[PDB]
Copies of this chain bind each other. A is one copy, B any other.
Amino acid sequence: TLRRYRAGEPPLTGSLLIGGAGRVVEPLRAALEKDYDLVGDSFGGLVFDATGITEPAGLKGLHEFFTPVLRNLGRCGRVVVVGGTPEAAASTNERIAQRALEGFTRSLGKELRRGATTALVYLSPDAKPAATGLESTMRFLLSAKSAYVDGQVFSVGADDSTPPADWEKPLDGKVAIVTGAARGIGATIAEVFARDGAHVVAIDVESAAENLAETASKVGGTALWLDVTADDAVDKISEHLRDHHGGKADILVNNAGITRWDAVLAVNLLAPLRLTEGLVGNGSIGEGGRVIGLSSQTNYATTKAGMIGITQALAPGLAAKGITINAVAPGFIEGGQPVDVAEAIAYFASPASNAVTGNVIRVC
């Protein structure tokens, strides 16, 4: 039975080794030293900086680092390889080697103890030497919050970051809109956001009735009964933000909720796109904003791909306004659990995740 996050428990099940050569090892060692049991004999985390590998021949560096240590990696352990964005390498030799990283981290998992995970994080070569924009990703990965995120690839760009005042309350003071919020993952996302100190606007359909009122109260948020596919949805959300939150939201989570071709397109693709375009277009979501999509056969497979489309298409335009857009694509859930999906969303929602945009991650 897998480790999920709690309280003032330590982030890892044991010590944390950071190795490799490159531009990430020192900044990370300095950044993670206070909160993690850092080393120079039973490991909770293994981090290899692969940024210094500039040719395929150098790929043996991976083998040389992990082989002596993998076996001593604990249950529910973390392995992270950090490389540089291959599209942006300085030589074709470097692009090949950094691309090859993905193969290594995704097959290593089959050698690991139960519940242990692996992850690949790419960092812009244009990120500044302190690598602040990387921190929220590492903390998410090196913690129990990321229990069911495995074999994934995270792409961090170039901007600097600022830690939240408190990494145990990273969403402290933020306003989050969550749709499909009465039951299911939606209700859980709302709960995890509140735990992290956000004020949640819980949105669902009018027939959710009391259930929605219930979620709002449990999370200390507010309820907004509304059909997100109606013409006036943007306007109604804005009005609610004017009354309860001085006209502004920080986070929009587009979750369809469980509460024909055209109905599926309208709910899982058209509506969330409209919501995003409108709430951004009118300034309700401004600098520091976070949009996070959550997918979930020909109907749905198209809207799931559509959601990936939104996330990639809107990222450039949105980054120029200081806003990130990301998505989570969950697997088999009712094994994997909702809290797990919610953590991933909360990781993107982080004010310290400003250098994470255009990403799509699978959970379970």
B-contacting residues of A (Cβ < 8 Å)? 56-57, 59-60, 62-63, 86, 89, 92-93, 95-104, 106-108, 110-111, 261-262, 265, 269-270, 273, 297-306, 308-310, 312-314, 317
Contact pick for A92, options B57, B60, B107, B317, CB 8 Å: B317
Task: State the Cβ distance, A42 to closest chain B Cβ, in Å.
Answer: 22
Question: A103 vs B303: C-alpha distance in the bound complex, in angstroms?
Answer: 7
Q: Is the interface of A mostly helix, strand, loop or mixed?
A: helix
Q: Report yes or no: B62 in contact with A302, Cβ–Cβ below 8 A.
A: yes
Q: Are B302 and A107 in contact (CB under 8 A)?
A: yes
Are B269 and A305 in contact, CB atoms less than 8 angstroms apart? no
Residue of B nearest to A273 (CB): B56
A108: chain B residues at CB < 8 Å are: 298
CB-CB under 8 A from A62, the residues of chain B are 302
With contacts A265-B56, A273-B56 known, is A95 near B309, CB below 8 A? yes
Copy number in this complex? Answer: 2
Evaluate contact between A297 and B92: CB separation under 8 angstroms. Answer: no
Complex: how many Å from CA A313 to CA B107?
22
For the complex, give the distance between the alpha carbons of A297 and B306 in Å. Answer: 33
Chain B: which residue is nearest A317 at the CB level? Answer: B92
Measured between beta carbons, the chain B residues less than 8 angstroms from A100 are 269, 302-303, 305-306, 309
Known: A59-B265, A302-B59, A302-B107. A99 touches B309 (CB 8 A): yes
Task: Tell me whether A314 and B273 are in contact in the complex, defined as CB-CB below 8 angstroms, given that A97-B309, A100-B306 are known contacts.
Answer: no
Report the bound CA distance from A305 to B105 in whole Å.
10
A301-B104, A303-B100, A305-B100 as given contacts; A265 in contact with B60, CB under 8 Å: yes
Q: Is the CB of B96 within 8 A of A306?
A: yes
CB proximity of A64 to chain B, nearest CB, Å? 9
Residue of B nearest to A110 (CB): B297
**How long is the Cα–Cα vector from A103 to B101 in the complex, in angstroms?**
26
| A273 in contact with B96 given A56-B306, A110-B297, A265-B57 (CB within 8 Å) | yes
CB pair B103–A301 under 8 Å, yes or no, is yes
| Given A92-B313, A298-B108; A305-B265 close (CB under 8 Å) | no
Q: For residue A303, which residues in chain B have a CB less than 8 angstroms away from its CB?
A: 100, 103
Q: State how many angstroms separate the Cβ of A47 from the closest Cβ of chain B.
A: 18
Q: List 24 interface pairs A-B (beta carbons < 8 Å), by A numbering.
A: A56-B269, A59-B302, A60-B261, A63-B261, A63-B299, A86-B309, A92-B317, A93-B313, A96-B306, A99-B305, A99-B309, A99-B312, A99-B313, A100-B302, A100-B305, A102-B305, A103-B303, A103-B304, A103-B308, A104-B298, A104-B301, A106-B301, A107-B302, A110-B297
